[PDB]
């Protein structure tokens, strides 16, 4: 179980003893249960949620009927949460209330798309020398493989292209503040993605 919110940028909190703790603030408009997938009817236990406000003209008839079984009147995206043993009816509303402070949590978003990186930026390679006789290749990868054994490049060779919008989980981030009146998690540190990207906050896998 977890929650779906959007990243509102990073801020800071000073404690009274004087340490500034770096804080990202994950705004969680309250998530609305659409299905409850049971192992009898679906093979596994899970719950679908929704987070608010799509236009009427952007919700298709299949999608509107799915959002009208569950009397939810629902919004951008649909997300899923594998469950162990929890019971949610298909109209319920899970909020930031499933988090306390302290409360180590795992946060996943989509990382910021760097476009088509080179091997220095993508895989932290070394550059060759810039001046000592070096011909045209100052920033290129070096050799790829070995000569005639094997006579081909091994799979998974580190080359260049698209440091992009992959899914990244950042795990064991402490919850600084659960602010349920205006629906906020304040989370210690960095979180993957830009401001306003969708971000999934569920408790820590390494506890």
């Amino acid at each position: 179980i977890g929650v779906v919110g959007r990243k509102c940028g990073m801020t800071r909190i000073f404690t009274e003893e004087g340490v500034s703790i770096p804080v990202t603030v994950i705004e969680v408009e309250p998530n609305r249960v659409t299905q409850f997938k049971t192992e009898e009817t679906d093979g596994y236990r899970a719950v679908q949620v929704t987070a608010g406000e799509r236009r009427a003209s952007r919700v298709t008839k299949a999608q509107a009927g799915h959002f009208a079984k569950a009397n939810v009147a629902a919004g951008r995206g649909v997300w899923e949460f594998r469950l162990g043993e929890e019971q949610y009816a298909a109209g319920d509303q899970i909020t930031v209330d499933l988090f306390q402070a302290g409360q180590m949590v795992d946060v996943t978003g989509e990382s910021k798309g760097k476009g088509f990186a080179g091997t220095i930026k993508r895989w932290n390679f070394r550059g060759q020398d810039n001046t000592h006789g070096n011909s045209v290749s100052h920033r290129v990868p070096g050799s790829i493989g070995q000569c005639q054994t094997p006579g081909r490049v091994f799979k998974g060779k580190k080359m260049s292209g698209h440091l992009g919008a992959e899914r990244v989980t950042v795990q064991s981030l402490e919850i600084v503040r659960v602010d349920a009146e205006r629906n906020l998690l304040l989370v210690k540190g960095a979180v993957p993605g830009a401001t306003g990207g969708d971000v999934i906050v569920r408790p820590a896998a390494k506890a």
């Binding site: 000073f14 004087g18 340490v19 500034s20």
Partner: protein, 120 residues
């Protein structure tokens, strides 16, 4: 100081005037050493009679960097000049007298003698 071959001043009374870091002690290849870290120096320039002579491989604590040390709120102290305090084998400072300020990050279990002598 922060790197092998960094030249840095000496905040001691009867030793060197310039040392050069030849190694950053600690890990396998530590490339950097800030305030409170332990470098090993060679003495490049010294006074005519004193406890330390020119070209003597010695250990030193870095007390004063111009990259600076950073506090728990994001405040940096940032000196104007790199300086070290030389040390003996059982790492106690050689000089009986310490010049210029040190910072608060240095009063550990081992360098209380430096902060006690400093005019911070």
């Amino acid at each position: 100081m922060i790197q092998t071959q960094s030249m840095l001043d000496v905040a001691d009374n009867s030793g060197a005037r310039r040392v050069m870091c030849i190694k950053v002690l600690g890990g396998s290849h530590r490339r950097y050493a800030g305030i409170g870290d332990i470098i090993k120096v060679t003495v490049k320039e010294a006074i005519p009679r004193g406890k330390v002579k020119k070209g003597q491989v010695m250990t030193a604590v870095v007390v004063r960097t111009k990259h600076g040390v950073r506090r728990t709120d994001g405040s940096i102290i940032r000196f104007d000049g790199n300086a070290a305090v030389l040390l003996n084998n059982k790492q106690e400072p050689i000089g009986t007298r310490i010049f210029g300020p040190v910072t608060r990050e240095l009063r550990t279990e081992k360098f209380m003698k430096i902060v006690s002598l400093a005019p911070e």
